[PDB]
């Protein structure tokens, strides 16, 4: 029997369905992993599109199934902002866990693939816009991502993204393992705060603005995490663009720049 899952209709219980296979039609399947598996779907009930993710193995024992819930959680955490993705409902059957979220568009991650180069600084600017409202809203609230990537952020019309991906979602006041390509560098030591997704977000825009590999470790890992941007790489970046990219990669999270900080700078407003 499928039950809801909260931290607060073609039903046909009888036929030997799952509700996912009874409720929803699978258009497509929108990616597949370690995660499971996510499918575009149109409700059966409501008939607008929406996005559905799948455990893909049944819940191995009580921590599986708590670790894998608390995504639930940290998305009911984040509640509804514009740059967010919302999640409409969550469900589990048969030790399989089930995420009903807004369809967005494409990652960062793959419209950046797709245009294989430097993205416009006129997009990036307003990626990095959205994403610190994003933030701004989590931090707000003492909520952190600590998964502040291109995968993670999702793109949607006239330009504007939302971040998605809150399992590693930490409430200040039990931490799991992040990119290392995108980790601040107080996180080593670790310090966790607001400031590390900031220092995330600022490797995402140097990644997608300057169509630069992050480093998963070594000397190159150093060099973008002693406050000195590479030079051979920004160099078309915008003197505007650099400077708040060296705010948001300062070292020190007790003098890197805040969210709302950055988006109370005037290049950066509105
Ligand atoms: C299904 C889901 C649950 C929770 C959550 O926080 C998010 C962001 C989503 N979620 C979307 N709403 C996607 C979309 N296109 O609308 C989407 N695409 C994905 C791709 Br592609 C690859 C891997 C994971 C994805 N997860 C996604």
Same mark, same amino acid.
């Given at each position: 029997?499928?039950?809801?899952?909260?931290?607060?209709?073609?039903?046909?219980?009888?036929?030997?369905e799952?509700?996912?296979?009874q409720?929803?039609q699978?258009?497509?399947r929108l990616?597949?992993?370690?995660?499971?598996?996510?499918f575009?779907?149109?409700?059966?009930?409501?008939?607008?599109?929406?996005?559905?993710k799948?455990?893909?193995?049944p819940?191995?024992?009580?921590?599986?199934?708590?670790?894998?819930?608390?995504?639930?959680?940290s998305?009911?955490?984040?509640?509804?902002?514009?740059?967010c993705?919302?999640?409409?409902?969550?469900?589990?059957?048969?030790?399989?866990?089930?995420?009903?979220?807004?369809?967005?568009?494409?990652s960062?991650?793959?419209?950046? /693939?797709?245009?294989?180069? =430097?993205?416009?600084? +006129?997009?990036?600017?307003?990626? *990095?816009?959205? @994403?610190?409202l994003?933030? &701004?809203?989590?931090?707000?609230?003492?909520?952190?991502?600590?998964?502040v990537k291109?995968a993670?952020?999702?793109?949607?019309?006239?330009?504007?993204?939302?971040?998605?991906?809150?399992?590693?979602?930490?409430?200040?006041?039990?931490?799991?393992?992040?990119?290392?390509?995108?980790?601040?560098? /107080?996180?080593?030591?670790? =310090?966790?705060?607001? +400031?590390?997704?900031?220092?995330? *977000?600022?490797? @995402?825009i140097?990644?997608? &603005?300057?169509?630069?590999?992050?480093?998963?470790?070594?000397?190159?890992?150093?060099q973008?995490?002693?406050?000195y941007?590479?030079?051979?790489?920004?160099?078309?970046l915008?003197?505007?663009?650099?400077?708040?990219?060296?705010?948001?990669?300062?070292?020190?999270?007790?003098?890197?720049?805040?969210?709302?900080?950055?988006?109370?700078?005037?290049?950066?407003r509105?």
């Amino acid at each position: 029997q499928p039950r809801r899952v909260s931290f607060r209709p073609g039903y046909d219980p009888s036929r030997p369905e799952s509700f996912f296979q009874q409720s929803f039609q699978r258009l497509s399947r929108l990616g597949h992993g370690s995660y499971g598996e996510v499918f575009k779907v149109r409700s059966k009930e409501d008939g607008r599109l929406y996005a559905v993710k799948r455990s893909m193995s049944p819940f191995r024992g009580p921590k599986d199934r708590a670790r894998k819930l608390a995504e639930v959680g940290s998305h009911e955490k984040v509640g509804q902002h514009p740059c967010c993705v919302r999640l409409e409902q969550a469900w589990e059957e048969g030790g399989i866990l089930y995420l009903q979220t807004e369809l967005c568009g494409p990652s960062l991650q793959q419209h950046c /693939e797709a245009w294989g180069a =430097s993205l416009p600084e +006129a997009q990036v600017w307003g990626y *990095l816009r959205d @994403t610190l409202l994003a933030l &701004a809203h989590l931090h707000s609230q003492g909520l952190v991502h600590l998964d502040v990537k291109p995968a993670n952020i999702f793109l949607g019309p006239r330009g504007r993204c939302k971040l998605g991906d809150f399992g590693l979602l930490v409430e200040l006041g039990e931490v799991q393992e992040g990119d290392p390509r995108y980790m601040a560098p /107080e996180l080593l030591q670790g =310090s966790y705060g607001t +400031a590390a997704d900031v220092f995330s *977000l600022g490797l @995402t825009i140097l990644e997608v &603005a300057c169509n630069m590999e992050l480093p998963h470790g070594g000397e190159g890992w150093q060099q973008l995490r002693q406050g000195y941007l590479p030079p051979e790489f920004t160099a078309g970046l915008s003197s505007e663009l650099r400077s708040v990219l060296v705010m948001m990669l300062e070292p020190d999270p007790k003098l890197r720049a805040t969210a709302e900080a950055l988006l109370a700078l005037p290049v950066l407003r509105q």
